[PDB]
Amino acid sequence: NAMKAIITVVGKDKSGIVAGVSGKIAELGLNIDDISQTVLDEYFTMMAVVSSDEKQDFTYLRNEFEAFGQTLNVKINIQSAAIFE
């Protein structure tokens, strides 16, 4: 990997979220290394670890996921894995 990141998705409705977010990840040419989804209280929640063999622009990715999350009524965060290693 040149890039790795953890993506967090929080919303109220689960409907179509896994398809939307996985499709977006794929649109951006990122690999899904792992994924998990959990209903928690009244919320549907989803986390994915993603990567690419090329350096990416987190400024762009963060804004792009944020804007995409908004279209689906969910909050999306992306964190570079560089924080841990």
Q: How far is the CB of 19 from K ion (least distance, A)?
A: 18
Residue with CB nearest K ion? 75
Neighbours of 15 (CB within 10 A): 12
Q: Contacts with a copy of itself in 1-20 (CB under 8 A)?
A: 6, 8, 10-12, 16, 18-19
CA–CA distance, 13 with 19 (Å, rounded to integer): 13
Q: Which amino acid is at 79?
A: Q
Show the binding pattern over residues 44-63: x = contacts a copy of itself (CB under 8 A), - = does not.
-x-xxx-x------------
